[PDB]
Amino acid sequence: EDVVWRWSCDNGKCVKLKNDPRSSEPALSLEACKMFCNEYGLLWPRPTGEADLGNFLSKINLNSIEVKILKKGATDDLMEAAAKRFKEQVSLAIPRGSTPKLTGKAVDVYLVNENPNEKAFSLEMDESYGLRVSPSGADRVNATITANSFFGMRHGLETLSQLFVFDDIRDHLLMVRDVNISDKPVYPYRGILLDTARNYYSIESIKRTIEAMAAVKLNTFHWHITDSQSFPFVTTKRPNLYKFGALSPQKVYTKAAIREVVRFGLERGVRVLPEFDAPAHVGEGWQDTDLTVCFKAEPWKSYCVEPPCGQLNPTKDELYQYLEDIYSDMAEVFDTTDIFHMGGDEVSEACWNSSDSIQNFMMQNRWDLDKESFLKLWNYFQQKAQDKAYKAFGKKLPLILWTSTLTNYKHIDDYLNKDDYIIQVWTTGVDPQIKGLLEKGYRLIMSNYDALYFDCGYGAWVGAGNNWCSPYIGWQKVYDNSPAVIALEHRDQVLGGEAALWSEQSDTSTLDGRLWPRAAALAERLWAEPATSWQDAEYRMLHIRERLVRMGIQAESLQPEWCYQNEGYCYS
Amino acid sequence: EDVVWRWSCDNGKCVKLKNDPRSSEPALSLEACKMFCNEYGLLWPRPTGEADLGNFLSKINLNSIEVKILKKGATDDLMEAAAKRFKEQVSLAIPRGSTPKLTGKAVDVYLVNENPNEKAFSLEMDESYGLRVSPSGADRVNATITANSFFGMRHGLETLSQLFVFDDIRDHLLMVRDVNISDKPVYPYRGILLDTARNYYSIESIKRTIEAMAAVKLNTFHWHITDSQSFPFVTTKRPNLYKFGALSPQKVYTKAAIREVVRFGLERGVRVLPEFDAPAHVGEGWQDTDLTVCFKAEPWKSYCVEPPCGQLNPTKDELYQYLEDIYSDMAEVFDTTDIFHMGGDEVSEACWNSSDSIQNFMMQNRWDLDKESFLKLWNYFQQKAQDKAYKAFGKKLPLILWTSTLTNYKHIDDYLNKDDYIIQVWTTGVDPQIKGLLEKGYRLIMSNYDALYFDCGYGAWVGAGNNWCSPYIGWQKVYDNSPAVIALEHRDQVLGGEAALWSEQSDTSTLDGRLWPRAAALAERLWAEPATSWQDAEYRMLHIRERLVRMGIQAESLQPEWCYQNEGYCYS
């Protein structure tokens, strides 16, 4: 049948009221009410610049939307792909199984890309845009998107799609009549880390994630493609690593698949950034090389922090030949990235000391066998690895390492430099290492475990109880976690943030729930850096969850739908 | 390419070993190793009777499996449907995108249903079966399932499908050669509670849940189809309840849909048991009847424990007319159930005292307005409701109520009797109410919140932080929760158990993850009541998760796949 209710704005909340026939006032559908009742309407993220949505809606004919590219260039194929997708994005306004009446105004969308040859990812890229919507003549609409680059332009198309609403009372597709918006992201790096080594993720699932990322303007996909558990990456040069390494012959990422993901990503404004974690977090795939130590060493608690143990043996010269090949193979298919992630997490001293070949190597270099000794070995490794990385990508590009014993701010300059290395923070956001790093000039990516570890809260995977970083981190917490607060005066050194989904307890099946809608909170916090808190964004967050579900994403459910329909009744 | 590894049983663990060519020993694929390395092989749940799996496997031709029904009867259509499904169940052994070679033995499956007219659900039904597998002649296999009823027989088919394994080294479909199994469930009621009022669940999603339930022999689906938030149930007699009540016109359960679910359930050995929660947990749909009080009362914390508030007004005579109609409409489409759930949870005293009509009613009956007064009103309501329920189902059938203030063992006999009412326990398993109830003769269904609330652990839905019953309950905890321990000598009074998925934070999108594989732990605990603990069942639990994923269920991920491939390395 037909919707029985209507909604009316009262003090910023849309209140459900009976749609009684004896009325001269036109009834508002729920989304139509939310669009003007809300300070930012239905947008996510909210814009940083002008956010004028006017007061009215116009009826639109879905079959009459046409996109026009004003300036041609090298990005033509991308701009064209993006335009094509736009209609599909508009249909997201409409609930599945619902059909709009094909009547109303025609929409002309004009795309103005001011530097149409530009298509490289960089920390310095311009993701800004201007959006204006206004009536044109009598039966049509002028939607104009003006941007400095394709990336900004695509972001604008994303915002524009959000400006459509379906009236399920009348079955009309509607559009906000007069719009003036200008926008740009606060932070350049807005990412998600996906661990595809602890469990395999289908490439279809990866692409789906990228679509959702695009929907909320996240721009970086960090592919942690290797670990001790498996080696899915198809390295042509050193094929045994994958052959021995993979969970199965099927559970692999071929050169053709990666290229598919990288392009799908580029079309959607998302950098696909690969990681080769070293010298720890290696195991499977390395058998018979004699290039690792402690693989599957028991008891595991003695030698590492999760099974199975395994580290690279930095004393072996052939190792650098393998790395050089791996890095080269990665560089070939990950050809949009401007950055390389080298891991650097959790190197185990015991594990290195249990090796004879290694102890023998150190005795010959005059180094002792104490912990400060081991840092010497780690640097020796990192310096050589780094050389190979530069060679593979054919240039010196910024490298990322996790916070660790090596990266402690007190001695970090002994090993690295702030120009060459970006540091990824997984400590608490209140840890001293952060300020100390910042004072030394280091750029950071925030992944603090207390707010940004998407894996936390489930059952234990070793033993019983719950996982290491429990409890489960709610969206309220992710939204309120602010890099600006964490870094203060050094804010400009914060490149941005990244949500982490480690996969000890995640795969293809759970990936949609783990990331959405929580990653959307990160997305707003990074794009806009609101002074405001989670409660101010709550209604919009409920809507965006609904949108992800419309997209086919199996998003986590946040509240009862009754709450979404009845703003303000559900609080605490 | 091809699998590179092989597995070998050593001390109950299958160890991954290189499949080296210079060997005279035939290589074992992972599942083939697990089948005999494990005490119960790949079965879930493990059987209670004979569990002899022999030592060998035979190659089978998938296209040559034929099912024969030996005894005809009223259950013919069911037996026939079940047989048809069997081939599909066997294909689950085979990973998607993999094809077995069509060679090997032909399998004859003989179904012997000893009481082929029997198809009613009851607490007393015989779910037992006998299963024997042995070679027949030279090129074929005799698989014989012998059971007292169709329900037992279907359970046997389920066990038999589990006896197939795919050799992905050779691409051969295999079957355990000599099997002797006899089995029966420890407890008659093995359920899942699904809350479809707090959020809507697509009927496709409901059916999918039933398939997974069937896979592990759960037999009861408790459909909590109404609450304060919505009224999805399509009641022909009182249509405004759904019309006003539903989240949308689409989000409704029609008579045709319910019948579809009820039959899909009956075919799969699952009772579909509806709940009409009263007198609390009512709201939406009741507008303009004047039959409720406190709907949306603010502040909500004063009048209920979750928004929105709302209770039935028991003083209104017309109320019983509505209930009678609702119960009748439920009875018509839920025509396989032998039991009715009437709710009885969380009645609010304040909410009743805020009503004038109600206070006026009590003053006239000589009752005071203290809390013991209110219990009088609740019973008055429950007694009348109960009369309508009997009338609707046309017989006196057992009724279920939650543990509550009414059901406190100290005064319970003042209100109910142990013959007429089953009590559903959501308290901790160590709460005194349990023993006290048991001592008074009451039958119970265990849903203790500390072990069996599937909703717990996520973010808060009102305010911030985490939900009320956090932390997240892991499968280890569900498995170890034992009704036999909880009830001791009174065990026979425990009808069984039920996993609860309340839906404040769950819907169609999250339903697979919320239930699986955790509900499988409940399934084993209820079917077998093992003396053993979770660690003893761990490898099998990993396999069953994989099976649910093969089924198309988006099961939660429990551990790294590396762990599944490398038994014993991952522990704590």
Ligand SMILES: CC(=O)N[C@@H]1[C@@H](O)[C@H](O[C@@H]2O[C@H](CO)[C@@H](O[C@@H]3O[C@H](CO)[C@@H](O[C@@H]4O[C@H](CO)[C@@H](O)[C@H](O)[C@H]4[N+](C)(C)C)[C@H](O)[C@H]3NC(C)=O)[C@H](O)[C@H]2NC(C)=O)[C@@H](CO)O[C@H]1O
């Ligand atoms: C069983 C138990 O509870 N034992 C207690 C412990 O409370 C206590 O210390 C705990 O020991 C655990 C090691 O078994 C530590 O767990 C590990 O924590 C690390 C992070 O420090 C995890 O690795 C990182 O995080 C992600 C996963 O979120 C992982 O994928 C990444 O590789 C990694 N990096 C982000 C750094 C790249 C690791 O997975 C996890 N291992 C597990 C759970 O098996 C735990 O941190 C530690 N807790 C504390 C508070 O120190 C123990 C002393 O060891 O004492 C026992 O009584």
Ligand SMILES: CC(=O)N[C@@H]1[C@@H](O)[C@H](O[C@@H]2O[C@H](CO)[C@@H](O[C@@H]3O[C@H](CO)[C@@H](O[C@@H]4O[C@H](CO)[C@@H](O)[C@H](O)[C@H]4[N+](C)(C)C)[C@H](O)[C@H]3NC(C)=O)[C@H](O)[C@H]2NC(C)=O)[C@@H](CO)O[C@H]1O
């Ligand atoms: C915000 C906060 O943390 N406030 C604290 C509280 O610790 C403290 O008491 C808590 O008050 C909450 C009421 O707002 C209680 O939450 C409610 O708990 C009931 C169970 O008792 C939940 O209903 C049952 O459970 C399922 C959901 O799992 C539900 O769908 C069912 O309808 C129902 N039944 C199974 C019985 C049928 C209810 O959903 C939940 N409501 C929420 C979360 O909004 C909480 O139980 C209570 N905790 C304790 C330990 O008492 C408060 C005093 O009120 O003080 C504050 O400082």
